[PDB]
CSV table of C-alpha atoms and ligand atoms in Angstrom, one decimal:
chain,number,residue,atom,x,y,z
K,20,UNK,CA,-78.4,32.7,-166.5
K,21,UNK,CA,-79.9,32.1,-162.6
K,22,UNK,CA,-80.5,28.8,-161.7
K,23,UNK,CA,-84.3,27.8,-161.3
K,24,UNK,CA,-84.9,25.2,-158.2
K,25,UNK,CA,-88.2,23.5,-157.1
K,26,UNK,CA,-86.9,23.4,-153.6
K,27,UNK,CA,-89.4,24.7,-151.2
K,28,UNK,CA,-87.2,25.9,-148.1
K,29,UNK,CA,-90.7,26.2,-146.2
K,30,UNK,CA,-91.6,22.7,-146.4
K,31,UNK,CA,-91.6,20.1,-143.3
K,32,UNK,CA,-89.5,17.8,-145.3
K,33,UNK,CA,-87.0,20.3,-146.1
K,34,UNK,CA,-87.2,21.7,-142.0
K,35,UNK,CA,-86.8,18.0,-141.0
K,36,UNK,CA,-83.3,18.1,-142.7
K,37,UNK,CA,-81.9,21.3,-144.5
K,38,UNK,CA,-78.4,20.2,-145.2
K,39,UNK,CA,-78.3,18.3,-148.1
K,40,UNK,CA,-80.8,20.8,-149.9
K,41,UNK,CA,-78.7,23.8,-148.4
K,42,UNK,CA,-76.0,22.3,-150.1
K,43,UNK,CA,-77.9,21.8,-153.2
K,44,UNK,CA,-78.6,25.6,-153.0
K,45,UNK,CA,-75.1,26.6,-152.7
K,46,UNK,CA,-73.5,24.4,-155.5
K,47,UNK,CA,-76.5,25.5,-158.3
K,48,UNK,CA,-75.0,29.0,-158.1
K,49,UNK,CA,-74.3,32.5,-156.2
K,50,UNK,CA,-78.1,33.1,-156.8
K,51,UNK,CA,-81.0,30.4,-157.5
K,52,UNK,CA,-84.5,31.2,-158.5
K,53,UNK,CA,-86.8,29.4,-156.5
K,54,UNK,CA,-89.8,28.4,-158.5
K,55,UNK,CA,-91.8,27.1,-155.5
K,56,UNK,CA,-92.4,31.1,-154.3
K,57,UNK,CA,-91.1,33.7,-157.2
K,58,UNK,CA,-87.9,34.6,-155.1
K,59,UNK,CA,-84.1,34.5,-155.5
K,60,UNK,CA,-82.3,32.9,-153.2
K,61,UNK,CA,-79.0,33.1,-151.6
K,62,UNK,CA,-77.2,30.5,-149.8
K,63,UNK,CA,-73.4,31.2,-149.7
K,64,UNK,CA,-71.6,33.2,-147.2
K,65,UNK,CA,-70.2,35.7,-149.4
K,66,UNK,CA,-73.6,36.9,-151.2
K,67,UNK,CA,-75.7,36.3,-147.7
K,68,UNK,CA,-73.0,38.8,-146.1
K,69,UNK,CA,-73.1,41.4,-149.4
K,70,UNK,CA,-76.7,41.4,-149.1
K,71,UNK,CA,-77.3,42.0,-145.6
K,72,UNK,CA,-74.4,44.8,-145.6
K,73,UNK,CA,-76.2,46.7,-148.4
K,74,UNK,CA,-79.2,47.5,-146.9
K,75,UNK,CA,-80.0,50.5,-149.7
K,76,UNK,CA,-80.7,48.0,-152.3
K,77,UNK,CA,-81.9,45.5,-150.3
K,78,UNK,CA,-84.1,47.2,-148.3
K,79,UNK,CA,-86.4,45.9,-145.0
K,80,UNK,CA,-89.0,48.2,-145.1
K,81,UNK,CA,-91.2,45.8,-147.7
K,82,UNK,CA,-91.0,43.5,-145.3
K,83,UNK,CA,-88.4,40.7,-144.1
K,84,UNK,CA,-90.9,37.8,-144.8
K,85,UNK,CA,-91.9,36.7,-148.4
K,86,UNK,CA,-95.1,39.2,-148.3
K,87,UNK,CA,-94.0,42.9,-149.6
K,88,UNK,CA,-95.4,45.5,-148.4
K,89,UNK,CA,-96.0,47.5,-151.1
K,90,UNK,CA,-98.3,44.8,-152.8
K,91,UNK,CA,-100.2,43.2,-149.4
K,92,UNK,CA,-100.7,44.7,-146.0
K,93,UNK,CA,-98.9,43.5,-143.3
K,94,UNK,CA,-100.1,40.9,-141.0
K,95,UNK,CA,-99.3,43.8,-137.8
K,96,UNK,CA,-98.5,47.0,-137.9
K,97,UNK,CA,-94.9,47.2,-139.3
K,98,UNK,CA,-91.8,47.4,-136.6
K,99,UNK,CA,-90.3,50.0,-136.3
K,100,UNK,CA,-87.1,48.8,-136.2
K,101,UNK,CA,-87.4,45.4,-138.0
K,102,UNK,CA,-89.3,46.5,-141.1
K,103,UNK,CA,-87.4,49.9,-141.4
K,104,UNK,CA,-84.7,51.2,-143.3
K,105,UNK,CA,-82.3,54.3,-142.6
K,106,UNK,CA,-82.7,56.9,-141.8
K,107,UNK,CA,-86.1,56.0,-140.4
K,108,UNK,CA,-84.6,53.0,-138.7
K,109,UNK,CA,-81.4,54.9,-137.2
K,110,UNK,CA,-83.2,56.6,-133.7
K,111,UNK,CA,-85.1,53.5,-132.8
K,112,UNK,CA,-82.2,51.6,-133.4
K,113,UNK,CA,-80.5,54.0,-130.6
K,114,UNK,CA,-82.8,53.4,-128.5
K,115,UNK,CA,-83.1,49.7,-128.0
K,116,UNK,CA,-79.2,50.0,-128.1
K,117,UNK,CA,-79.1,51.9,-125.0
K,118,UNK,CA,-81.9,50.4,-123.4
K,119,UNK,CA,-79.9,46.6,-124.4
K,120,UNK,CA,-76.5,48.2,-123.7
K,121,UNK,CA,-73.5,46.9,-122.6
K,122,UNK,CA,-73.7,48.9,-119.4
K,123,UNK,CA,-77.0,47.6,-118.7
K,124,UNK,CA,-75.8,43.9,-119.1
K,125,UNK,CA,-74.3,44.5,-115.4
K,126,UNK,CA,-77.9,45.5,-114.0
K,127,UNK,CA,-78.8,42.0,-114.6
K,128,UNK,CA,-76.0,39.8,-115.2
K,129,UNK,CA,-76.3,38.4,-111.3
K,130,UNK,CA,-79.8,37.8,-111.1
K,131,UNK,CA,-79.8,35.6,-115.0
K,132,UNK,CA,-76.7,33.8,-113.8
K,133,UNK,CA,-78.2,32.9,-109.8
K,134,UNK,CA,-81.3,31.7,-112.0
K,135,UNK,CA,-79.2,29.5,-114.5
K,136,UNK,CA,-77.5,27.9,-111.1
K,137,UNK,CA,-80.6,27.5,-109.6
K,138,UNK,CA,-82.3,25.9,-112.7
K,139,UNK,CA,-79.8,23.7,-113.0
K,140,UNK,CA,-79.5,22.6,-109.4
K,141,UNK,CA,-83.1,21.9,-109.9
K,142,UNK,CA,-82.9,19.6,-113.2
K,143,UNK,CA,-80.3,17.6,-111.4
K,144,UNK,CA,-82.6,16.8,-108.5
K,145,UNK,CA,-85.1,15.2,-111.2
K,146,UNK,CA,-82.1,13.6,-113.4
K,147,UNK,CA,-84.0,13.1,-116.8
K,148,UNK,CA,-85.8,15.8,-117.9
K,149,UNK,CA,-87.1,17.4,-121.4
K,150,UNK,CA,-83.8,19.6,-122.0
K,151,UNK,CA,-86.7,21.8,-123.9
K,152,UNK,CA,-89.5,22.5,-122.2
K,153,UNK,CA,-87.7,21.9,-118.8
K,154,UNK,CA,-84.3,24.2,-120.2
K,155,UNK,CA,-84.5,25.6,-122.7
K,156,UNK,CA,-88.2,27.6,-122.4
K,157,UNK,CA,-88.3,27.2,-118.8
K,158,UNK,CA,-84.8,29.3,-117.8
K,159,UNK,CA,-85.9,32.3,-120.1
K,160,UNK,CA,-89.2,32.6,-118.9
K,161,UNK,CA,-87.4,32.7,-115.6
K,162,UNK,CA,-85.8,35.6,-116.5
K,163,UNK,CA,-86.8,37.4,-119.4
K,164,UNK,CA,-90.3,38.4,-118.4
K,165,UNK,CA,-89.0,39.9,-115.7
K,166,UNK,CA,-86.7,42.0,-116.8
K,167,UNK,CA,-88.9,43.2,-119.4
K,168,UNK,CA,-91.4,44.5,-116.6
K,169,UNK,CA,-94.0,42.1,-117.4
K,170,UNK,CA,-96.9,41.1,-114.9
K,171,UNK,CA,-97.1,37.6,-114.0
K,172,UNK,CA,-100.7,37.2,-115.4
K,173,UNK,CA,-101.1,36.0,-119.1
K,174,UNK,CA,-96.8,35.3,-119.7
K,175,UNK,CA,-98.9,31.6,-121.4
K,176,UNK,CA,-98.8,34.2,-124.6
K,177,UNK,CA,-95.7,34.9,-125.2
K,178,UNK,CA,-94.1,32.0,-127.0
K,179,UNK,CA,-97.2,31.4,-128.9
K,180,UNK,CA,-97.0,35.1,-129.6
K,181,UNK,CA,-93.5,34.4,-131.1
K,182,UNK,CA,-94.4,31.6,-133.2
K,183,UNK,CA,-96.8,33.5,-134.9
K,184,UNK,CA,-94.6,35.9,-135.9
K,185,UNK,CA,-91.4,33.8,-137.0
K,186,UNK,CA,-94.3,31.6,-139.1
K,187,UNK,CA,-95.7,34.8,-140.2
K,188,UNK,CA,-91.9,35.8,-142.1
K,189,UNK,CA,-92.9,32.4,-144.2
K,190,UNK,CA,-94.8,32.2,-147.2
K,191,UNK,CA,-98.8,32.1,-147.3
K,192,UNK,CA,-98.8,27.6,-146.5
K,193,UNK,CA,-100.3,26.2,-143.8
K,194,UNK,CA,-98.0,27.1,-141.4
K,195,UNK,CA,-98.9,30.4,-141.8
K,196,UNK,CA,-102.2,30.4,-142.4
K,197,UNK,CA,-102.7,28.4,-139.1
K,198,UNK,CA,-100.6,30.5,-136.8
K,199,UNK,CA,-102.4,33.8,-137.7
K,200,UNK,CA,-105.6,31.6,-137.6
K,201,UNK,CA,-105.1,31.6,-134.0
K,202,UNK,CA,-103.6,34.8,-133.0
K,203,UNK,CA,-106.0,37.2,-131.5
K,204,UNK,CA,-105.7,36.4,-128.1
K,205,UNK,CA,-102.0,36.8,-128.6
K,206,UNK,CA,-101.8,39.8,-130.5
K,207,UNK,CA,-104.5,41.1,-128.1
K,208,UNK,CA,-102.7,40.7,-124.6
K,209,UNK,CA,-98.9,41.6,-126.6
K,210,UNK,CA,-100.2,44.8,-127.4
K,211,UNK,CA,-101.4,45.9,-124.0
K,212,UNK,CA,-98.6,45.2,-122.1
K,213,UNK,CA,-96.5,47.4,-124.7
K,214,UNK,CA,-98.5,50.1,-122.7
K,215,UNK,CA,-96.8,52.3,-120.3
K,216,UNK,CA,-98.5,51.6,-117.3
K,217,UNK,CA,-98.3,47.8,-117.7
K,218,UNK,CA,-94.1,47.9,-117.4
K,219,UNK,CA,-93.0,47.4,-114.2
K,220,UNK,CA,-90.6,49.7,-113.0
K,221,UNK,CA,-86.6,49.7,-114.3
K,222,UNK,CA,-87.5,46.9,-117.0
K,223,UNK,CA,-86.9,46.6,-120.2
K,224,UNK,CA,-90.4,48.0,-121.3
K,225,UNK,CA,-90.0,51.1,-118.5
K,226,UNK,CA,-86.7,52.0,-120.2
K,227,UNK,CA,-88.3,52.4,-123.6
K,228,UNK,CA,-91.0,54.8,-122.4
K,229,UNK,CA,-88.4,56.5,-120.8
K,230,UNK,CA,-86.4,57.5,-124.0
K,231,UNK,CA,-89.4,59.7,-125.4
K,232,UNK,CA,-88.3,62.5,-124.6
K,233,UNK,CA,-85.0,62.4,-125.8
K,234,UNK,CA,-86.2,63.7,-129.1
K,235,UNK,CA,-85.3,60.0,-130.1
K,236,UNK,CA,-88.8,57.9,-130.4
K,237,UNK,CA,-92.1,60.0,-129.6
K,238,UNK,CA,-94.8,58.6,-126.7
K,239,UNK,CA,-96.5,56.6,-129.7
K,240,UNK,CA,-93.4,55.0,-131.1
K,241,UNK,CA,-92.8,53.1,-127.6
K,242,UNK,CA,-95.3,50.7,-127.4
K,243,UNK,CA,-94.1,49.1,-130.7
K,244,UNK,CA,-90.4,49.2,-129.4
K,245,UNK,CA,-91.7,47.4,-126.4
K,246,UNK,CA,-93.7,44.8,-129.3
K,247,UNK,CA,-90.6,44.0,-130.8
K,248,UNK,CA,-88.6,43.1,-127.7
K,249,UNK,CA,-91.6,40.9,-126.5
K,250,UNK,CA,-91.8,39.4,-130.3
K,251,UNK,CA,-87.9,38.6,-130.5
K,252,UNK,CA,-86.8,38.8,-127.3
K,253,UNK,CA,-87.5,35.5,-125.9
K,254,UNK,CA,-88.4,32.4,-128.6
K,255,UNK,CA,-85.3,33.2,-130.1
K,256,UNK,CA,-83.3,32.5,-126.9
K,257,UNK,CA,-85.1,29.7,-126.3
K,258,UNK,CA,-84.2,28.0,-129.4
K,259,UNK,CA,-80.3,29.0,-128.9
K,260,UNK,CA,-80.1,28.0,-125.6
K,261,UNK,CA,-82.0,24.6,-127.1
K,262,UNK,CA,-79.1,24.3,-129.9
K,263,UNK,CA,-76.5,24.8,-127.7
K,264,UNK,CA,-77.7,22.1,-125.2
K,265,UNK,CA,-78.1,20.0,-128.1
K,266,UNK,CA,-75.0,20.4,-129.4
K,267,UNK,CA,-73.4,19.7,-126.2
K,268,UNK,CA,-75.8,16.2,-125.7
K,269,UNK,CA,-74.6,15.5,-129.8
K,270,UNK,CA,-70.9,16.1,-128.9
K,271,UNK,CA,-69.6,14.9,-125.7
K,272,UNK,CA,-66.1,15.8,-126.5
K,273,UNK,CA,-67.2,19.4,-126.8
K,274,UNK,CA,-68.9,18.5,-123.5
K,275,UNK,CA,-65.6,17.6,-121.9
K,276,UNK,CA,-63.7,20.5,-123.1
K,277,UNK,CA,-66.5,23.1,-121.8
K,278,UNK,CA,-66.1,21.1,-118.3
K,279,UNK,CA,-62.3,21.6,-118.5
K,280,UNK,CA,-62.7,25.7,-118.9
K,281,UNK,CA,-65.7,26.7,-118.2
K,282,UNK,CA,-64.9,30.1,-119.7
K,283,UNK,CA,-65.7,28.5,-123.1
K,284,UNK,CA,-69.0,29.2,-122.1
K,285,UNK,CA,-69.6,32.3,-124.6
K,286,UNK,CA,-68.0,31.0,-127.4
K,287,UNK,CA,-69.6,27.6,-126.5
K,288,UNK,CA,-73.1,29.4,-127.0
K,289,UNK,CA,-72.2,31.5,-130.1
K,290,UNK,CA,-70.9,28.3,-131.8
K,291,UNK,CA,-74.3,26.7,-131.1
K,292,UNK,CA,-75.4,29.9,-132.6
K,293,UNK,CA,-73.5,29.3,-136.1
K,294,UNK,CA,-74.1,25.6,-136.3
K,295,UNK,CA,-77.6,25.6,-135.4
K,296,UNK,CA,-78.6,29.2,-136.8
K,297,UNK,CA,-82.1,29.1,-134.9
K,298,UNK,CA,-83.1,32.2,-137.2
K,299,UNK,CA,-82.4,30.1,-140.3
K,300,UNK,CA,-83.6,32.5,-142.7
K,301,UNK,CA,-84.9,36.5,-143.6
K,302,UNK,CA,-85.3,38.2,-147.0
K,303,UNK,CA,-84.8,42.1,-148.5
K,304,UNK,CA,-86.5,43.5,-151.3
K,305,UNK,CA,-84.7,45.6,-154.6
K,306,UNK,CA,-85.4,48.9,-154.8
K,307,UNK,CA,-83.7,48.6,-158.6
K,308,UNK,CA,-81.9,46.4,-160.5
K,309,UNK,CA,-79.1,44.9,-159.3
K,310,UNK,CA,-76.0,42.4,-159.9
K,311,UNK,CA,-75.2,40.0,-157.5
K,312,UNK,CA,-73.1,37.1,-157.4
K,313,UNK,CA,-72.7,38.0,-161.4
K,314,UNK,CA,-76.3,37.5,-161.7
K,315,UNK,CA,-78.7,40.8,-162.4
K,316,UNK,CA,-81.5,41.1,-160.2
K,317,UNK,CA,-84.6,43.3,-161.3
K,318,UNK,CA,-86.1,45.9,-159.0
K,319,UNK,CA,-88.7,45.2,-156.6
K,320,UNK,CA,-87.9,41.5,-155.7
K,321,UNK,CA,-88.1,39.5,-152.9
K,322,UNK,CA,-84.2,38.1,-151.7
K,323,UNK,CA,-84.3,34.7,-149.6
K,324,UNK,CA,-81.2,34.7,-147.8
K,325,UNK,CA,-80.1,31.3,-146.1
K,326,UNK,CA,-78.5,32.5,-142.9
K,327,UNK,CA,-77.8,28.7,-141.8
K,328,UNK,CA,-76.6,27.6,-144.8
K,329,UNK,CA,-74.2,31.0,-144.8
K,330,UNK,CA,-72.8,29.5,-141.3
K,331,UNK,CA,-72.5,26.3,-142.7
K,332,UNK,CA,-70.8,27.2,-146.1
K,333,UNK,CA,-67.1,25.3,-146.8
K,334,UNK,CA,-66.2,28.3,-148.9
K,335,UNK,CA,-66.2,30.1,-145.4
K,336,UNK,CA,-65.5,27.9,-142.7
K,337,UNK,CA,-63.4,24.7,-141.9
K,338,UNK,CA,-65.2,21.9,-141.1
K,339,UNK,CA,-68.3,24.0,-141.3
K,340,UNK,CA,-70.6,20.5,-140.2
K,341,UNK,CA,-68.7,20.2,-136.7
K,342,UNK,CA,-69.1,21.5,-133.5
K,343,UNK,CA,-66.1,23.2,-132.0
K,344,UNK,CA,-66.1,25.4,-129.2
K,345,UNK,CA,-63.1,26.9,-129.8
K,346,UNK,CA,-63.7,28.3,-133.2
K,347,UNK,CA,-63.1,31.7,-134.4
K,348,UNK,CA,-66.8,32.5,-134.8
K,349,UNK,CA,-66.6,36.1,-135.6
K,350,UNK,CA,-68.1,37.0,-139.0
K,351,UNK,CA,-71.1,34.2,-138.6
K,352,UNK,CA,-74.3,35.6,-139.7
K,353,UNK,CA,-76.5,33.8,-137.1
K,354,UNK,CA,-77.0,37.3,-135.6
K,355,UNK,CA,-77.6,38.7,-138.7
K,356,UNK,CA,-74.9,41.6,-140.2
K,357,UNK,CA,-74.5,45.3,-141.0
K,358,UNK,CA,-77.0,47.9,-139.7
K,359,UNK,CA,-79.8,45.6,-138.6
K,360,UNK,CA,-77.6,42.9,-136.8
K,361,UNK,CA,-79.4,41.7,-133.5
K,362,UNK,CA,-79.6,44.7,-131.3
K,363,UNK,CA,-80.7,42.3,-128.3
K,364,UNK,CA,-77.5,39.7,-128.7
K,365,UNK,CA,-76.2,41.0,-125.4
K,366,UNK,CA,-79.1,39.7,-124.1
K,367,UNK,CA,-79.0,36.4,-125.7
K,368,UNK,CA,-75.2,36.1,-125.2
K,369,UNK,CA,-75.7,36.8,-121.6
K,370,UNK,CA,-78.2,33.9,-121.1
K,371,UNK,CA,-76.5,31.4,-123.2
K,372,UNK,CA,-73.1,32.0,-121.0
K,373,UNK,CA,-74.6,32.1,-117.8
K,374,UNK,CA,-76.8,28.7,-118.6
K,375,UNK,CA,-73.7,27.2,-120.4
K,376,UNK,CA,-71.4,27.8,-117.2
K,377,UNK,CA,-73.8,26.6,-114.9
K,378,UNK,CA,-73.8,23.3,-117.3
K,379,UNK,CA,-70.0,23.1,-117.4
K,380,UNK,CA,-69.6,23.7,-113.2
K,381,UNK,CA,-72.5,21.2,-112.4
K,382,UNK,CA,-73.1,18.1,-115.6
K,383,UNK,CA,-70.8,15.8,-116.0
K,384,UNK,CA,-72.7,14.1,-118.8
K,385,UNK,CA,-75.6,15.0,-121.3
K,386,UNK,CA,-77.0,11.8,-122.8
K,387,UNK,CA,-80.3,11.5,-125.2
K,388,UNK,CA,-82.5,9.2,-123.3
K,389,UNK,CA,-85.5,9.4,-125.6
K,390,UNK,CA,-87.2,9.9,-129.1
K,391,UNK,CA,-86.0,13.4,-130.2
K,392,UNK,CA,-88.6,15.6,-132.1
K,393,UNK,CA,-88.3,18.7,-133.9
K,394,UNK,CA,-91.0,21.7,-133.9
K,395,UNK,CA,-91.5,23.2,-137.2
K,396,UNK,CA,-91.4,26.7,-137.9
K,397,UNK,CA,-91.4,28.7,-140.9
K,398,UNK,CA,-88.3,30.7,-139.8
K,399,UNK,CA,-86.9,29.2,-136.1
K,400,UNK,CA,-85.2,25.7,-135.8
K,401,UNK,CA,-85.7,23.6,-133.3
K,402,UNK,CA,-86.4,20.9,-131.2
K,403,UNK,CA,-90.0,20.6,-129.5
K,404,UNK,CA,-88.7,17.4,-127.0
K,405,UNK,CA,-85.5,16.6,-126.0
K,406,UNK,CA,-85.3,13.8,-123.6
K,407,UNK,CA,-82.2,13.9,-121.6
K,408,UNK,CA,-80.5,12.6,-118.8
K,409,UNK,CA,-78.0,14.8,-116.6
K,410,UNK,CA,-75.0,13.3,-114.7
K,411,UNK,CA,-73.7,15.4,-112.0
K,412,UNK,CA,-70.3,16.4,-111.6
M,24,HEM,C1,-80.0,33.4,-130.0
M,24,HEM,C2,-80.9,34.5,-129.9
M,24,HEM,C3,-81.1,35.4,-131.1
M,24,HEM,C4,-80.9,35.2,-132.5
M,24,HEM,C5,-80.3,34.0,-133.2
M,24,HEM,C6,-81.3,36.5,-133.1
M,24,HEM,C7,-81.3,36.7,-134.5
M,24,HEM,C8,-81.5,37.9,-135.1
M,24,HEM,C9,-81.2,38.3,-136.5
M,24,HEM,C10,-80.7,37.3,-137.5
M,24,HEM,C11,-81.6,39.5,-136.7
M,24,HEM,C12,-81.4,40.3,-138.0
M,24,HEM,C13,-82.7,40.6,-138.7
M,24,HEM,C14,-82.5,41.2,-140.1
M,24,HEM,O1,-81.3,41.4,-140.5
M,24,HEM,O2,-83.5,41.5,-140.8
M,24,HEM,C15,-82.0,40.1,-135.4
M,24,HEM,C16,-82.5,41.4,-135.2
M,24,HEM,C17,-83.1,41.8,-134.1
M,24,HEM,N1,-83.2,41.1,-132.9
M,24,HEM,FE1,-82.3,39.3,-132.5
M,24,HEM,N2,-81.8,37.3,-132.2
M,24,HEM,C18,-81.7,36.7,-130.9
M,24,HEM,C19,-82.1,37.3,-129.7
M,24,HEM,C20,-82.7,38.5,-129.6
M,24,HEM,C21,-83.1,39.1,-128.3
M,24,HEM,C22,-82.8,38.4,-126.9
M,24,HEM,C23,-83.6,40.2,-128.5
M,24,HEM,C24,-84.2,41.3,-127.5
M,24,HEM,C25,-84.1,41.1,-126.2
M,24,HEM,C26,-83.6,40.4,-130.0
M,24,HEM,C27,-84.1,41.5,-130.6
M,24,HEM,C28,-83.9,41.9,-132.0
M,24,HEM,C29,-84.3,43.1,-132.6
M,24,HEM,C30,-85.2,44.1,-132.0
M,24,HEM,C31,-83.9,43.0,-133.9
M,24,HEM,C32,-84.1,44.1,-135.0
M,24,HEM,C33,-82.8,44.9,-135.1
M,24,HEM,C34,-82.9,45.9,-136.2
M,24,HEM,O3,-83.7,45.7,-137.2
M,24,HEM,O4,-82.1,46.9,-136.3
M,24,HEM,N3,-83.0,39.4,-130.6
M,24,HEM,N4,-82.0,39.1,-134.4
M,25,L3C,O1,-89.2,44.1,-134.3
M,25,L3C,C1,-89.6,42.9,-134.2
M,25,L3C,O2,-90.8,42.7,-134.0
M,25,L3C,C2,-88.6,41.8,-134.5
M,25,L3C,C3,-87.3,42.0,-134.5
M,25,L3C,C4,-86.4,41.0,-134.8
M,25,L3C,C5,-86.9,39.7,-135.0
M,25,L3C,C6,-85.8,38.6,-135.3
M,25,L3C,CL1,-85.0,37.9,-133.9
M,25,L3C,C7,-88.2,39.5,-135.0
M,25,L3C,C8,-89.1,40.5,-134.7
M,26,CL,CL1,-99.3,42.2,-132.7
């Protein structure tokens, strides 16, 4: 028998602070019903990890918000990548892989890491800044346009663009309704920059047009490749880079450590990654019945699965409520798991470590020098303010 909770994981209060009720969801079970929506739910590591890794039975291509697909139509066209299973999913997958690929990381590695320095340099002349908008949004904008092949004119929509879309994952409440309320412009300018001739040369966006004719994506599948980097490719960084520099402001002795090697840098950021989870939460959809966790599951129903509670599960991790930037992090689901798993972390590692070195070279102290407030999103954590003050080394 399946636990039934009246928890709504989509409310502010529950967004404001998600630990105790994570907790809650955990301890009532391997799988809860939650009444609030009509979904299961699944907050422990091990049944988050099964899920994700079976992607047959807990299929994407209803849809990775509440909505499925099957029963409403989908706010945008599906992705391609996102809201696809194998084998349908496999060749655009291969795609974004090579055009995200380890060898590219060394086309751009200098130029994100000069920009970190300089960004940082540049907070420190000011001395108390908004670690968010000043940090956090304003080093990946730096970059990340660019090397997507963006024009200068219009970038305004692109984290707006994102917050519709992470809100859109969440159930029909006002969140929801609100963001998609708004988002014509958005959607308007998104998609025509996904066209060919709006990509600047040897970006991100060129490199997908380039691959149709590989036999891998055709002409037509590349502007919605190019919709999916611009959708995850950039909120989603911002929000790490904002947990990490968080974390570091929350824990000085972590602070002090990073300082002492800066080569913690990566591990610094993927840690942020696991204790903050910015993408907190996704679901899957049966296609049949299933048992999970001992409990059976019938076909044809929506899967909530807490990734940040997964990442911050005892059964799983030591001390799973500290920050340690040391920690074996490999196995955290902040990234996601099995065939779908982030194809852009190269990206987001890259910009984490670079902006995490430059912190651990230059700041000798991160201190909270004002009211902290928290932006509220149906499937990003956050911060929307975060006053600091930076000490120089
Ligand atoms: C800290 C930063 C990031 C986090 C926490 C994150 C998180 C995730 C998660 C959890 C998934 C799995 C979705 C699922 O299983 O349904 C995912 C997939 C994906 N991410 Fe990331 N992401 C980040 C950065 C990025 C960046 C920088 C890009 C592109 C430049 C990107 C592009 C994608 C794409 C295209 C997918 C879909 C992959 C697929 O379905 O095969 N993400 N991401
Ligand atoms: O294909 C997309 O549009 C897409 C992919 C991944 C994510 C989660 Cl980072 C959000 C949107
Ligand atoms: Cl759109």
């Amino acid at each position: 028998t399946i636990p039934h909770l009246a928890i709504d994981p989509f409310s502010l209060d529950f967004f404001d602070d998600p630990y105790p009720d994570q907790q809650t969801l955990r301890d009532a079970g391997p799988v809860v019903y939650l009444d609030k929506w009509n979904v299961y739910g699944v907050a422990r590591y091990a049944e988050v990890h099964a899920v994700l890794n079976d992607p047959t039975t807990f299929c994407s291509s209803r849809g990775v918000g509440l909505s499925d697909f099957k029963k409403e139509k989908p706010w945008r066209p599906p992705s391609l990548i996102l809201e696809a299973d194998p084998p349908a999913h496999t060749r655009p997958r291969a795609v974004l892989s090579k055009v995200l690929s380890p060898a590219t990381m060394k086309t751009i590695r200098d130029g994100f890491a000069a920009a970190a320095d300089a960004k940082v340099d540049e907070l420190l002349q000011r001395g108390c800044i908004d670690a968010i908008a000043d940090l956090a949004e304003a080093y990946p904008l730096s970059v990340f346009p660019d090397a997507m092949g963006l024009k200068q004119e219009g970038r305004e929509h692109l984290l707006p663009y994102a917050g519709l879309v992470f809100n859109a994952f969440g159930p029909p409440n006002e969140l929801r309704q609100t963001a998609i309320e708004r988002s014509a412009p958005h959607q308007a300018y998104v998609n025509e920059q996904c066209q060919r001739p709006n990509l600047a040369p040897g970006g991100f966006g060129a490199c997908i047009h380039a691959f149709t004719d590989t036999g891998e994506i055709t002409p037509d599948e590349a502007p919605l490749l190019v919709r999916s980097l611009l959708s995850a490719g950039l909120d989603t960084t911002v929000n790490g880079i904002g947990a990490a520099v968080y974390c570091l402001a929350r824990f000085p002795g972590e602070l002090q450590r990073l300082r002492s090697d800066p080569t913690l840098a990566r591990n610094a950021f993927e840690e942020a990654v696991r204790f903050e989870s910015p993408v907190q939460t996704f679901f899957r959809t049966t296609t049949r019945e299933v048992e999970l966790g001992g409990a059976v599951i019938g076909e044809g129903e929506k899967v909530l699965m807490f990734l940040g509670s997964a990442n911050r599960d005892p059964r799983r991790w030591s001390d799973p409520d500290l920050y340690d930037i040391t920690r074996k992090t490999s196995g955290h689901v902040g990234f996601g798991s099995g065939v779908h798993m982030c194809v852009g972390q190269l990206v987001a590692r890259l910009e984490g470590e670079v902006m995490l070195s430059a912190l651990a070279r230059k700041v000798a102290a991160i201190d909270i020098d004002g009211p902290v407030k928290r932006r509220f999103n149906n499937t990003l954590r956050g911060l929307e303010s975060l006053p600091v003050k930076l000490t120089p080394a």
